[PDB]
Design an enzyme around this catalytic site. Structure first.
Site, PDB file in Angstrom:
ATOM      1  N   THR A  48     -17.768  17.676  62.715  1.00 23.61           N
ATOM      2  CA  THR A  48     -18.365  16.889  63.805  1.00 23.61           C
ATOM      3  C   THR A  48     -17.625  17.188  65.130  1.00 23.61           C
ATOM      4  O   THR A  48     -18.261  17.165  66.134  1.00 23.61           O
ATOM      5  CB  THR A  48     -18.429  15.410  63.381  1.00 23.61           C
ATOM      6  OG1 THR A  48     -17.211  14.976  62.780  1.00 23.61           O
ATOM      7  CG2 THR A  48     -19.583  15.177  62.455  1.00 23.61           C
ATOM      8  N   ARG A  56     -25.018  11.690  57.291  1.00 27.41           N
ATOM      9  CA  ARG A  56     -25.098  10.265  56.957  1.00 27.41           C
ATOM     10  C   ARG A  56     -24.153   9.407  57.807  1.00 27.41           C
ATOM     11  O   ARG A  56     -24.224   8.167  57.574  1.00 27.41           O
ATOM     12  CB  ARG A  56     -24.869  10.011  55.460  1.00 27.41           C
ATOM     13  CG  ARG A  56     -25.703  10.953  54.591  1.00 27.41           C
ATOM     14  CD  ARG A  56     -25.623  10.456  53.124  1.00 27.41           C
ATOM     15  NE  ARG A  56     -26.451  11.337  52.322  1.00 27.41           N
ATOM     16  CZ  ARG A  56     -26.192  12.618  52.015  1.00 27.41           C
ATOM     17  NH1 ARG A  56     -25.115  13.244  52.479  1.00 27.41           N
ATOM     18  NH2 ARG A  56     -27.040  13.305  51.260  1.00 27.41           N
ATOM     19  N   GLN A 104     -18.845  21.342  50.529  1.00 26.10           N
ATOM     20  CA  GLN A 104     -20.277  21.163  50.445  1.00 26.10           C
ATOM     21  C   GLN A 104     -20.902  21.728  51.702  1.00 26.10           C
ATOM     22  O   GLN A 104     -22.112  21.608  51.791  1.00 26.10           O
ATOM     23  CB  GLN A 104     -20.530  19.674  50.275  1.00 26.10           C
ATOM     24  CG  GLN A 104     -19.861  19.137  49.041  1.00 26.10           C
ATOM     25  CD  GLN A 104     -20.136  17.677  48.829  1.00 26.10           C
ATOM     26  OE1 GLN A 104     -21.268  17.285  48.601  1.00 26.10           O
ATOM     27  NE2 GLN A 104     -19.096  16.858  48.908  1.00 26.10           N
ATOM     28  N   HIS A 124     -22.905  24.421  48.381  1.00 25.28           N
ATOM     29  CA  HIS A 124     -24.286  24.278  48.883  1.00 25.28           C
ATOM     30  C   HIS A 124     -24.679  25.576  49.592  1.00 25.28           C
ATOM     31  O   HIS A 124     -25.742  25.572  50.273  1.00 25.28           O
ATOM     32  CB  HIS A 124     -24.406  23.006  49.739  1.00 25.28           C
ATOM     33  CG  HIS A 124     -24.095  21.779  48.962  1.00 25.28           C
ATOM     34  ND1 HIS A 124     -23.879  20.568  49.566  1.00 25.28           N
ATOM     35  CD2 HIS A 124     -23.922  21.608  47.633  1.00 25.28           C
ATOM     36  CE1 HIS A 124     -23.632  19.687  48.664  1.00 25.28           C
ATOM     37  NE2 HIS A 124     -23.651  20.323  47.438  1.00 25.28           N
ATOM     38  N   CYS A 132     -27.517  39.831  47.284  1.00 25.09           N
ATOM     39  CA  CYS A 132     -28.448  40.772  46.607  1.00 25.09           C
ATOM     40  C   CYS A 132     -28.998  40.086  45.355  1.00 25.09           C
ATOM     41  O   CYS A 132     -28.201  39.748  44.433  1.00 25.09           O
ATOM     42  CB  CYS A 132     -27.765  42.082  46.209  1.00 25.09           C
ATOM     43  SG  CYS A 132     -28.879  43.301  45.439  1.00 25.09           S
ATOM     44  N   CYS A 135     -27.916  43.104  42.687  1.00 27.94           N
ATOM     45  CA  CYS A 135     -26.512  43.330  42.221  1.00 27.94           C
ATOM     46  C   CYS A 135     -25.577  42.139  42.448  1.00 27.94           C
ATOM     47  O   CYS A 135     -24.373  42.267  42.087  1.00 27.94           O
ATOM     48  CB  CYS A 135     -25.908  44.628  42.755  1.00 27.94           C
ATOM     49  SG  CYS A 135     -25.570  44.644  44.535  1.00 27.94           S
ATOM     50  N   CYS A 161     -28.827  50.710  46.285  1.00 25.87           N
ATOM     51  CA  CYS A 161     -29.196  49.551  45.422  1.00 25.87           C
ATOM     52  C   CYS A 161     -30.603  49.081  45.774  1.00 25.87           C
ATOM     53  O   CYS A 161     -31.455  48.898  44.872  1.00 25.87           O
ATOM     54  CB  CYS A 161     -28.264  48.363  45.641  1.00 25.87           C
ATOM     55  SG  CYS A 161     -28.825  46.867  44.789  1.00 25.87           S
ATOM     56  N   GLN A 226     -16.441   6.385  57.173  1.00 27.12           N
ATOM     57  CA  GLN A 226     -17.337   5.479  56.443  1.00 27.12           C
ATOM     58  C   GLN A 226     -16.832   5.296  55.017  1.00 27.12           C
ATOM     59  O   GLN A 226     -16.028   6.076  54.499  1.00 27.12           O
ATOM     60  CB  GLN A 226     -18.760   5.965  56.297  1.00 27.12           C
ATOM     61  CG  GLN A 226     -19.580   5.953  57.571  1.00 27.12           C
ATOM     62  CD  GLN A 226     -20.910   6.669  57.431  1.00 27.12           C
ATOM     63  OE1 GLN A 226     -21.066   7.562  56.595  1.00 27.12           O
ATOM     64  NE2 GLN A 226     -21.921   6.262  58.195  1.00 27.12           N
ATOM     65  N   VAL A 242     -10.387  13.008  60.886  1.00 31.09           N
ATOM     66  CA  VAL A 242      -9.633  13.977  60.045  1.00 31.09           C
ATOM     67  C   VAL A 242      -8.686  14.798  60.917  1.00 31.09           C
ATOM     68  O   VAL A 242      -7.573  14.988  60.519  1.00 31.09           O
ATOM     69  CB  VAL A 242     -10.578  14.858  59.252  1.00 31.09           C
ATOM     70  CG1 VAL A 242     -11.099  14.039  58.099  1.00 31.09           C
ATOM     71  CG2 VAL A 242     -11.736  15.406  60.137  1.00 31.09           C
TER      72      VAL A 242
HETATM   73  N1  LIG Z   1     -14.407  13.374  62.621  1.00 29.86           N
HETATM   74  C1  LIG Z   1     -14.545  12.680  61.467  1.00 29.86           C
HETATM   75  N2  LIG Z   1     -13.419  12.249  60.834  1.00 29.86           N
HETATM   76  C2  LIG Z   1     -13.539  11.536  59.679  1.00 29.86           C
HETATM   77  N3  LIG Z   1     -14.662  11.217  59.003  1.00 29.86           N
HETATM   78  C3  LIG Z   1     -15.755  11.724  59.617  1.00 29.86           C
HETATM   79  C4  LIG Z   1     -15.784  12.415  60.824  1.00 29.86           C
HETATM   80  N4  LIG Z   1     -17.103  12.774  61.125  1.00 29.86           N
HETATM   81  C5  LIG Z   1     -17.846  12.325  60.154  1.00 29.86           C
HETATM   82  N5  LIG Z   1     -17.057  11.691  59.174  1.00 29.86           N
HETATM   83  C6  LIG Z   1     -17.582  11.113  57.961  1.00 29.86           C
HETATM   84  O1  LIG Z   1     -17.938  12.177  57.152  1.00 29.86           O
HETATM   85  C7  LIG Z   1     -18.897  11.785  56.167  1.00 29.86           C
HETATM   86  C8  LIG Z   1     -19.812  12.969  55.974  1.00 29.86           C
HETATM   87  O2  LIG Z   1     -20.677  12.692  54.788  1.00 29.86           O
HETATM   88  P1  LIG Z   1     -22.161  13.251  54.893  1.00 29.86           P
HETATM   89  O3  LIG Z   1     -22.634  13.200  56.333  1.00 29.86           O
HETATM   90  O4  LIG Z   1     -22.949  12.530  53.839  1.00 29.86           O
HETATM   91  O5  LIG Z   1     -21.898  14.778  54.440  1.00 29.86           O
HETATM   92  P2  LIG Z   1     -21.563  15.279  52.921  1.00 29.86           P
HETATM   93  O6  LIG Z   1     -20.735  16.505  53.217  1.00 29.86           O
HETATM   94  O7  LIG Z   1     -20.728  14.160  52.276  1.00 29.86           O
HETATM   95  O8  LIG Z   1     -22.974  15.597  52.344  1.00 29.86           O
HETATM   96  C9  LIG Z   1     -23.119  16.117  51.048  1.00 29.86           C
HETATM   97  C10 LIG Z   1     -24.325  16.997  51.115  1.00 29.86           C
HETATM   98  O9  LIG Z   1     -25.490  16.154  51.212  1.00 29.86           O
HETATM   99  C11 LIG Z   1     -26.367  16.657  52.242  1.00 29.86           C
HETATM  100  O10 LIG Z   1     -27.679  16.552  51.853  1.00 29.86           O
HETATM  101  C12 LIG Z   1     -25.926  18.121  52.404  1.00 29.86           C
HETATM  102  O11 LIG Z   1     -26.420  18.890  51.351  1.00 29.86           O
HETATM  103  C13 LIG Z   1     -24.414  18.037  52.237  1.00 29.86           C
HETATM  104  O12 LIG Z   1     -23.858  19.292  51.819  1.00 29.86           O
HETATM  105  C14 LIG Z   1     -19.578  10.565  56.751  1.00 29.86           C
HETATM  106  O13 LIG Z   1     -19.256   9.585  55.796  1.00 29.86           O
HETATM  107  C15 LIG Z   1     -18.881  10.351  58.110  1.00 29.86           C
HETATM  108  O14 LIG Z   1     -18.504   8.994  58.139  1.00 29.86           O
HETATM  109 ZN   LIG Z   2     -27.528  45.053  45.497  1.00 31.90          ZN
END
Ligand SMILES: Nc1ncnc2c1ncn2[C@@H]1O[C@H](COP(=O)(O)OP(=O)(O)OC[C@H]2O[C@H](O)[C@H](O)[C@@H]2O)[C@@H](O)[C@H]1O
Ligand SMILES: [Zn+2]
Length: 282
Positions: A48, A56, A104, A124, A132, A135, A161, A226, A242
């Protein structure tokens, strides 16, 4: 796909007060020092601070969709720079403190940051990575591969290939890559400390991997603004940015956050660099 369960979106953020945040990050330092095998689990919240919205969070892709609103990007995928958290993960792998990284994210930033691909599972897939069909050779491009849902990109395999190249972006129906999942699961099963960064842990089986560390008595730490699906199971929950948690942790660890030299691809982990000596704990 239209019908797809997008789990719980737009939950309130939690902000630990600074004295509680300082305390919890010291405790994370103590766990890192005590652990033989540390695995990190990342999700969209570590990017972010690079301009990339999550799914989310209050302004998540899925959250804003629930409300008829559009998510905002502050960068392209190509112009996005790895965050301080991304660069700290590079450093912790180089000093032997990070055994494996499980992500992810499809944003490509772990690879571009220079993180060894042989120590990463991209659960993901990766928007810069085509594969490919023939291969299984993967190609890491300098721009986003234009398709999603494992579709042919229009390029052929140049291995010594002519296989059809496809994207690696999983669709809703798509099973996770066996290779990445198996190494992720093994690392998670065998780890004594699993640390989650900016993931809400709502996706099966991605979000379950940290719980595997818990069996045979491993410790689980969750850093997230969250609530997350597994907050009950965590030995330590840190409610903060983070970048701030990782920055303070690195200082406690005596480690610098290295410079990003622009997009690079490391296939294979380099020989481990020296690390500061360990504090006496007790
Ligand atoms: N700077 C920040 N510092 C701390 N927490 C943060 C920050 N920014 C956001 N967050 C938190 O980061 C969390 C991000 O959770 P989500 O947004 O669900 O991402 P996933 O990686 O878990 O999604 C899983 C898969 O689902 C999807 O369909 C895709 O396929 C994804 O690959 C939130 O709770 C924010 O509060
Ligand atoms: Zn190939």
């Amino acid at each position: 796909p239209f019908t797809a369960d997008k789990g719980k979106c737009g939950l309130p953020e939690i902000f630990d007060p600074p004295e509680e945040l300082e305390r919890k990050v010291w405790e994370l330092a103590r766990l890192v020092w005590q652990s033989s095998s540390v695995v990190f689990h990342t999700g969209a919240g570590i990017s972010t601070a690079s301009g990339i919205p999550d799914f989310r969070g209050p302004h998540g892709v899925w959250t804003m969709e629930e409300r008829g609103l559009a998510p905002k990007f502050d960068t392209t995928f190509e112009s996005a720079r790895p965050t301080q958290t991304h660069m700290a993960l590079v450093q912790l792998e180089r000093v032997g403190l990070l055994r494996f990284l499980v992500s992810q994210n499809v944003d490509g930033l772990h690879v571009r940051s220079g993180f060894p691909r042989d120590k990463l599972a991209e659960l993901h897939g990766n928007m810069f990575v085509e594969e490919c069909a023939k291969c299984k050779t993967q190609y890491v491009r300098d721009t986003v591969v234009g398709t999603m849902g494992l579709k042919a990109t229009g390029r052929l395999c140049t291995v010594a290939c002519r296989g059809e190249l496809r994207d690696t972006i999983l669709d809703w129906e798509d099973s996770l890559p066996d290779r990445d999942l198996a190494l992720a699961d093994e690392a998670s099963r065998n780890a004594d400390l699993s640390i989650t960064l900016g993931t809400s842990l709502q996706i099966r089986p991605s979000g379950n991997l940290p719980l595997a560390t818990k069996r045979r008595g491993g410790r689980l730490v969750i850093v997230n603004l969250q609530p997350t699906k597994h907050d009950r199971h965590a030995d330590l929950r840190i409610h903060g940015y983070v970048d701030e948690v990782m920055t303070r942790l690195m200082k406690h660890l005596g480690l610098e956050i290295p410079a990003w030299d622009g997009p690079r691809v490391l296939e294979r982990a380099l020989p481990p660099l020296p690390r500061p000596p360990t504090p006496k704990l007790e």
